[model samples]
Target chain A: ASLKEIIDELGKQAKEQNKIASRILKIKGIKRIVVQLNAVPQDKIRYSLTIHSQNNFRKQIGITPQDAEDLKLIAEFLEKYSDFLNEYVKFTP
Target chain B: ASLKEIIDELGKQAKEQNKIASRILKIKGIKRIVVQLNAVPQDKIRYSLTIHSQNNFRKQIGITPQDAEDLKLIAEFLEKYSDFLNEYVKFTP
Candidate 1:
C-alpha cells in the first residue's frame, strides 16, 4: 500500500505485455510454427508447437508431420490458451 | 485474363499480407520503431520512422533525440497511415 497498487500492477502488466509482445510481435521469438514433412522452410516456419509442454517448441527446421502426436498435444494446449494468439498469430500451409 | 485476375490479385495480396505480417507478427521486418536519444533501448526499440519517405527507416543504433524534426516528420507519416499500426504496434518512453 505504498506507491500505488494500480501503478505497480500496470508496471507489472507493461513488462509482461512487452515480453509477450516481444515473443509474438518482434522477431526475437516464436513465429510461424507447424508440424512438418521436411518441415519448415526457414523464415517461413518459425515455431513447432506441442501438446506436451515439456516438448513444446522447436526451431522448425527438420520438423516433420510424423510429429503430429506432438502437434496434437500442441493443439490441446492451444485450445486452452489460444484466446490471445489468434489476434496476431496465423497458421500457414 | 491470365489464369484469373482475382486469383492473381489474391496471390499478390497474400504475398503482401505475409510481408506486412512478417513485419507485424513474425517479427522479421519491424516491431517497435521510435525517434531517438542515445535512442532505442536495444530490443526495446526496433524502427526509426520519418516524415520523409526518402529518409524513412533506420536500424536503431546510434540514434539521437535531437532528431525530433524527423520524428515530427515520422509523426506525420504515422498520422497518415497509422490506422493499421494501432492494432499491433506501440511507441515508448
Candidate 2:
C-alpha cells in the first residue's frame, strides 16, 4: 500500500473511534474532556484522554502503575480496530 | 457551526492542501521533507515544513528576515484554499 493510503485509512479509523470515545466519556459525566493524539511514532499512535472534574478524577480513573494494565487493554482494542481495516482494505496500485 | 464542524473542515482542508504542497515541494527538488503540525490552540493550526538538503538549500530558499514577506504571501494563499471550503460547505444540525 502507498503511504498516502495508509495514512488516510489510519486517519479515518482514528476519527471514528474518537467520536465513539467522546460519546462514551460524555455518558460517564466527564466534563471538559480533551482527546489528543500523542506525539509518538507514526507506526505507534498513542491517544491521551484527559477528563477534567471537580473531584480527583485522575485517581478515580486508576492513573497509577496498576492502571497501565487497563491502558494496555484500551490500546489493544484500538489496535484491533486498525488491524481490521488493514486486513479488509486492499490497496491496489 | 459547532466546534467539531470547524475541526472537521480544517482537517479536510489541511490534508488536501498538504497533498498539493507535497507535490509542489517534490517538484522543487525538496529531499526528505517533514511536515508536522504545530501544537497550539485549535484556532491557530500551524504547519512546519522542513526541507532537507545536502547543500545549503535553506540559504538558497531565503530563510532569513527578508523572506518574512514572501512567507506571509504563501500563508495567505493557503488561507484562500481554506476559505473556499468554508464558503461552499454549509453545516446543518
Candidate 3:
C-alpha cells in the first residue's frame, strides 16, 4: 500500500485509542488515562494503557460482583491489545 | 463512546502509523520510519513522522519538481496531523 494508506490507517487507530480513553473516563472519578508505546528495535513495541483511580473508583462506586467482573473483562481486553500490537509492530523503522 | 472506543481508535491509528512505516519501507531505500508521540502533561500530544535518507533519497530517485511539490504536500499533511491531534488532546489526564 501507499504511504498515505499507511498514515491513514494509523490516524484511525490513534482516533480509536483516543476514543477508548474517553470511555475509561466515563468510570466515575477516574482521574487519568494513558496509552503508551515502547517500541524497541529488533524486538517489538510495548503498547499498553492504564486507567487511574481504580481504588478510588471502587470506593466511590461501591463493590459489586458484576462490576468486578466487568473490570476483569476490561483487563482481558487490554491483554489482547498487547498481543495484537506485537503482531503489527513488525516494521523495523 | 467508552474507554474501549478510545483505545480502539488509538490502536487503529497505531496500526496506520505502522502501515505508513511499511509504506515508507517500500520507498527505494528508506532506512527508517518513526511515528512518534511527544505527549506532555497539561498539553497536546506532539505526533509526527519522518522519512529518512532524504539527501540520499533525492539523489537516488532524482526527484522532479513535481516530486518536490508532492513532498511539500506531504509536509502540509503532516502539519495538519499535528493540528488534528491537538484537537483531541483535550482530556487533562
Candidate 4:
C-alpha cells in the first residue's frame, strides 16, 4: 500500500478509538478518561503520531524520513490499537 | 515543499482554528460555536477537505489524484483559514 493508504487505515483505527471514547464518556459517572498507545521502532512503524499531533491537529500525520522506510510499524499499530480499542475498551465501555 | 509540506501547512491552520474554538469555549455564555469556511476550485486547491473529513480525522488529509496537480488550492486554504482563525476568530475570541 502507498503511504496514504497506510495512513488512511491508521486514521480509521484512531477514529474508532475516539468513538469508543465518546461512548465511555456517555456514562454519567465518568469524568475523564485517557488512552495510552505506544509504538516502537522494531515494529517498523511508519509515521510518528507524536510528530503529527505536535505540528497540528488539522495537519496530516506524516511518516518522517526515518519512519518512511517501513510500513510494518504502522500496520502493527493498526492491529494492536484496533484490538485494544475494540475488544478491550469498547467492550468494557 | 512536497505534498507533505503542503498538507503540513494546511494542518497548522486547522489546529489554529481548533485553538480559537477552545478559546471561544473558555468564555461563559457560549453554548456552541460553528466556524464556516468555503473554498473554490479556481484556487487550484490541492486535496479535497471534504474527502479528508469524511474518511477519518486521524488520517492525514490527502491531495486526491485530482487535486494533485496544483498546490494553489492548498495554499489558499492555508492563507484563508489562517487569517480567519487568527485575525478574525482569535481576535474575537
TM-score of each: 0.19, 0.19, 0.20, 0.21
lDDT of 2 at B39: 16
Off by over 4 Å in 2: A1-21, A25-62, A84-93, B1-93
Q: Judging by TM-score, tell me the better candidate of 2 and 3.
A: 3
What value does DockQ give for candidate 3?
A: 0.01
Write the residue-wise lDDT of candidate 2 on B11-82 in tens digits: 566555553111122222222321122111233343222222234333212121222233333333335344
Candidate 2 residue-wise lDDT at A73: 37
Lowest lDDT 10-residue stretch of candidate 4 chain A: A20-29
Rank candidates, TM-score, best first: 4, 3, 2, 1
Q: How far is candidate 1 from the true structure (C-alpha RMSD, Å)?
A: 20.3
Tens-digit lDDT string for candidate 3 (B14-47): 4555431112312222233211222122212222
Report the number of backbone clashes for model 2: 0
Error of 4 at A7 (Å): 22
Clash count, one per candidate: 13, 0, 29, 7
Listing every candidate in turn, what is its Cα RMSD in Å to the true structure after a full C-alpha superposition?
20.3, 19.8, 21.4, 17.6
Candidate 4 Cα misplacement greater than 4 A, ranges: A1-71, A91-93, B1-93
- Model 1 spans with C-alpha error above 4 angstroms: A1-93, B1-59, B82-93
| Candidate 1 C-alpha error for residue B3, in Å | 28
Whose lDDT is higher: candidate 3's or candidate 4's? 3
With candidate 4 superimposed using the best TM-score fit, by how many Å does residue B55's alpha carbon deviate from the native?
5.2
